[model samples]
Target: SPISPIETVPVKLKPGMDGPKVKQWPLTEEKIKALVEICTEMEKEGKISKIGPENPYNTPVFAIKTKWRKLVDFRELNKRTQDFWEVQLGIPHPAGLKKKKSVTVLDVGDAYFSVPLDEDFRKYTAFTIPSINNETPGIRYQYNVLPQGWKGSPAIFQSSMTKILEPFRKQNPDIVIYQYMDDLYVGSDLEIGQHRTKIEELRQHLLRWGLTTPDKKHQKEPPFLWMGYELHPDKWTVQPIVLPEKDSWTVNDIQKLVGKLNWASQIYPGIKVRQLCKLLRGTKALTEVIPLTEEAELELAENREILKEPVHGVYYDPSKDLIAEIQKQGQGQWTYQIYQEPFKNLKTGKYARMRGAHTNDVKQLTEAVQKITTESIVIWGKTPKFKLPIQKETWETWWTEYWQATWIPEWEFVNTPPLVKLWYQLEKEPIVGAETFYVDGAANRETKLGKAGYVTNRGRQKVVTLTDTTNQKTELQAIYLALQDSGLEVNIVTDSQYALGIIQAQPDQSESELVNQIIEQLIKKEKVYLAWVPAHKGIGGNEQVDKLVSAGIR
Candidate 1:
């Protein structure tokens, strides 16, 4: 008896007459005869209909060494299929899989053909078989079942399989059963007596759902091969059997090694195979010998040994208190001994396994923490409270230099300007009672008008425009306005490096005269200091002043 169509929706094709029509491949006499028989049987069952070039689309047929080997080349049909099915089928991890002893692995023979296609979608799968028994060529025929080589065929099969298995899953809560494509694995931590009943029930369930299982026998325990890696339930560890022989290894071998390592690393995130992969990446020629470094060789050896050891399963448990202390050495290094226990190596090297069940090394943990700390420094440079506590001698030496920081009589702007020196001094001896007024300058080239913006609280901007001038002159005008108006100790923050340099000017009449007024004013009553801040950063005062400059121009 013919199986009924499973798909409920119509197969949608990409809208165009420009779809590809692949030429059919030459088939053997036996293959052609078999194909004719299948087509004849299908048509007799009313599962398919004959069509012509008016709604033309054809796919190729290839022969395999089987009695009724007829494969539909839905490659053209595949090109038109949509990519809506992106959700991955949840395949259970075979390794570190606990509480599962008895096992049964099932396979559905010619799985895709088991589900019949929807009546409306049958035409999109149309293909041609060459003339048989003096019959006309170009006789188009469509599949009654979900055919191979269509893009959505696997997804459709997976969906259908999941629906069939859902009932069994709900019934057996203790049993662990999962399917990858057409293969089904039914397992439970049950004795022989219980598993016999469970297995029979599953076998009967599959029969009801029109699923056929292969005659392959199931192994009692695992050290069973599922997915790509070997799964062992005894110690609950999953390891790669992916180690390839070093001898006769070409560039191709290295590429496969890298590919295998990459997949293994995803399963075990602690694996440091990235650097090893990178080291051998430059082999362009197949003839080239794969570069095997001593470190990579050592890593491969370590990986093989590590996988043999059983790793504990990680999950939520009852809350428990943990205490650890870190002591900083005088040489700017930190060593941590958790719970006052001395670090011991698990294997060799400076790596030690943790106190309890988790298969983690102490060295890996410390390195991970240290890496995070280093990354923080790289991201946010020397944040406040990042200061190392100064010893008495270091503090004294720093303080002595602080009082001796003589303010140069002439503000000297060298090629490599003294602005950084001034900056260092400002960091060491930050002025007290200084009201910080962030100032910025902007100029409109079109209008030839210069503008300046000032903010004391880093908000509430006061913007003004004076005579047409360069960016430096405009910045100076901003500084002059800030110092004059405030009449108190003020810190003017500017983005302009040129403006900062001019304030610390050499004793030249032209340059100093404009800058000397501010310096003289600072030496007498007001304490005015010009500091530089990088522009457009989210530094509050700097950003506000920058926006104010744009506002003034507008």
Candidate 2:
């Protein structure tokens, strides 16, 4: 680079060792002459200078497919280079181009080479070219400015570039400048004239520091690209995905295509590689020619068909409402895919293992499903769906005593679906000697809200809340939740004759699904009994239980 060095960047090297004096790879006469002449030209350009072979650090060079740029063996030198200030830089991506009236991108001509380093540290970049005569030692050369091939060079160069731009940045605080190493993007919310003025000001700042931008590449307008995206004056749309132009693609070519699709998938969540992804299952060397079997050819063509139109890249805002879905990808592993408001595909993540589920990454809406030993209730949604059995004031008593986070009014109960039969007939005889369980309902007269819960001597109480439900429906669920409470056998008596007739007699199945659910669950119980007690002498302790249900009404 012809750019002058404004400041010396700091570099930290590991102690105790210098890189090995690596041997150069063999080259024919023509290539040797080309390499020798190239080195002499660089010397004349002041990029490199002859150095004594006695320097402890010595790296080697080799040829490449491109214009003969230096390819050095900096591996040994790299480990000794040590790590410091190795970081990443980000650029402000305007939401599409609407936010900016105009934009300009400027690139540093010889990115890293333009930055000069301390002469005391030049030995770390020492390398040798082959000697013209076979009998003598190779000629050693060291860079005067920062050279290619060191691992920390880019990061150091980025920091050094930013340091140079500090004064310019302070001068115009409002004009946004996005920096990514040598490339710079200038954007403005003002008019094009203001954008042009900022561009001219930036050009002067760069030249003052001795960095040059080619006259032809000086100012870029929209309908151009920066980094990689084809940013435009209004919005940016990605070029359509393209298949390799090769007559016969090698496995490596297919691998590259897969890599690219994976990257694009992040931007366009709905892009499917269903059949294409399958082709990667086998063990095949990347260099081998891919066999385009019937399915493989069909898949390749099917994937390429998406290129009929370019995909418009969108900016997703986290504040907006989004719809999400879960898809199982493997055994006990599933992934979450998100979308725009209605059904536009947005983004997807890798399959992550889920807790509380062991069969598959996901299950059939088994949102909550656990077996109540004998209760065969329809395991349809939440166990709390019934709105049965809980009282607030009484709960405060048990909770503070044990602070049992385990004891929340949310004691839900439902039978495992696959294991229990959905419907069954109930036995009428009350099981004697078991604890007498009182199941009842309470309704708020003004609001018409209804709630219920079962209370037993063992202190197990479950109550639920529901909006304007019939008191009879509340009693029906209390029975269902009680049959669900797994630990003990108890005799439950309800004051409402209608609840027993509907739950036990079961004929338009007055409660339809609820009737059958209660019936099967009653049959599933061992010693539990569902009976109707005469109102004159109700069931045991229902007087105190009514008080418990009353406090939860509000």
Candidate 3:
């Protein structure tokens, strides 16, 4: 972080002193034991006898797996319910999400295209990334308010707005509540003909709610842009910014744009985009020649296998000094492998738990049956027999002799197939690779800068580096901007699960703003991805990019 400090606002609660209580149940040791006994006794002997060899319930189930929810495609609800609710009202995304509102004119709707706060200001909250660029050097900071894009902006705005609206909602039953993001469009478009009549009344209602409209200072009018498409009564149209258009771009733009749009198709349904994007051998024409349908987006979402089947295998080592490079790749889920060691054999000169290596990190082996509970990505594991190419008589004889010794007779075991494991996992894939570039902008003789994206390819990156000495987000935004410029898509990947989790848990306002900003940047030929990558796993390209970017800081 090469940025200076600012004032800090503390959370309203002390640790363990407030908020939701951890869910716990009361059960005594004897009560639990008695319950276990009763449960075990409830199992009937005839039940086991009645069951087939394939179906066995010999052991009692214990312990629930605790993992943060990952890859829940609530997109159906996100598109239909969420989008419809917000778009119908012409609101910008909520405040606190400054990056999304950077592109707009009004404040009536959610600020979907606002610029972000400087990166230093952004590190405060879990709700939003505070700054438009990870850095804030060029902009004047005369305004007294905390930067709009800082993470705290949304919470502060919401809290104030909530206090303001709390009384209004209580008084006026007709003033409906619909929040897309930071832009709160409280008044309803429920009736026709008397639109302004309802709006003036709604304005009075907001007055009672303690919020004054920003029309006097910044917004073109009280009208706002909500969701992506709709706007309010003032006839305000939030125009799209023309990207630094170019007839020809480097390879980076080709990757970023394709990847960004590809991701957009996923978030914005019914947008069937093209597939198989690449740079031409000679011409530099940017092309979106292919079209798609709703079916195509659906198919693309379902086809994780496309990413899994790599045409080539390249070893990546994390130890080396990897430079910051951006490649525009189609945006999709960032998938990775989670390791689970096999349960070992013991007592008879066989595999056994040699410490924490073999077991405990993973759940105990359960029945071979597939139980698709919401708790797990899949059933415990798959059952695949390891057959040997030996004499038929000898195989049978060996099984008969070592059936009890080599296997768990009472317990059914299923070794998960490698194929299924790969299929179930999610990962981020980059569309472009790093190439040598000559950047004279840095103090160093040669600097490597690249972009990473989700889906879309734009040709041009923003390098909003900060003059302060501690703003790390500037570097982050530089990486993002480069990817955005180069037509690269992104899925944010960081070693810090905490920071990743913060971005992962998005506010409604943050969602619209984040979506709008990232999408717009991508539309211009660049894309952005926010994902987490493991600390070590020998990935060569990312490692190199990380190194080069680190050396080029202002």
Ranking by lDDT: 2, 1, 3
Tell me the tens digit of each residue's lDDT in model 3 across 192-227. Answer: 436445555555655443334454245443334344
The candidate 3 region of ten consecutive residues with least summed lDDT is: 344-353
Better of 1 and 3 by lDDT: 1
- Residue 59, candidate 3: alpha-carbon lDDT: 18
Q: State candidate 2's TM-score.
A: 0.55
Residues 187-280 of candidate 2: C-alpha lDDT, one tens digit per residue: 7767877677778778877877767764434556666654445566645544345667677777788788876665554334334444455566
Q: TM-score per candidate, in order?
A: 0.52, 0.55, 0.25
Off by over 4 Å in 1: 1-10, 15-34, 37-57, 64-68, 87-91, 95-98, 132-135, 138-140, 214-221, 236-250, 259-275, 281-283, 290-554
Count of clashes in candidate 3: 136
lDDT of 1 by residue, 282-392 (tens): 646877776677877876776666554533322111132111222222111222221111221001111122222111111223332344334323322211111112233
Native-referenced Cα lDDT, model 2: 0.58
User: Candidate 3 — which residues are off by over 4 angstroms?
Assistant: 1-151, 180-182, 187-193, 208-210, 214-249, 263-554
Model 3 vs. true fold: TM: 0.25
lDDT of 2 at 108: 81
